[PDB]
Amino acid sequence: GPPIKLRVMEAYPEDVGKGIVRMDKASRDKLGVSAGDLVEIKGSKTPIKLRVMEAYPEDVGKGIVRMDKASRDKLGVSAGDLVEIKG
Ligand SMILES: [Cl-]
Ligand SMILES: [Cl-]
Ligand SMILES: [Cl-]
Numbered sequence: 001g002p003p004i005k006l007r008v009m010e011a012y013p014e015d016v017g018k019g020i021v022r023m024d025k026a027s028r029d030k031l032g033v034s035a036g037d038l039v040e041i042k043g044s045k046t047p048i049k050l051r052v053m054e055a056y057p058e059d060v061g062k063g064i065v066r067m068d069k070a071s072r073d074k075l076g077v078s079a080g081d082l083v084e085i086k087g
Contacts, residue, residue: 001032003086008041010079011068012056021085022066024055033087041067042084043075 006027015022021039023031033039038049050067059066065085077083 001087002030003084004030005082005084006065007063008072008077008079008081008083009059009064009066010072011066015053015066016068017070018053018068019050019071020053020067021050021071022053022055022059023085024060024062024064026061027055027063027065027085028052031085031087037087040086041065041071041075042086043072043077043081045074045076048074 033052035052035054037052039052040047040049
């Protein structure tokens with residue numbers, strides 16, 4: 001559906017090495033996606049796809065997505081950057 005911009009932040013250690021993105025309900029609902037769906041994320045390198053998982057309560061309403069450093073490096077983005085996401 002429509003793309004949205006979200007601030008990428010580092011995965012909690014619990015989630016390092018899972019090909020996932022933690023996204024909150026407002027973000028998922030704007031994108032039209034569910035947990036388990038793949039989303040495409042754009043950065044300075046070529047885009048990647050990650051699997052949506054429900055945000056942690058600590059992060060709800062903050063406009064962020066969490067993904068691990070391997071994902072950010074593959075995207076050519078840093079923690080704190082805005083990234084474009086699309087379902
Ligand atoms: Cl998982
Ligand atoms: Cl959520
Ligand atoms: Cl590189």
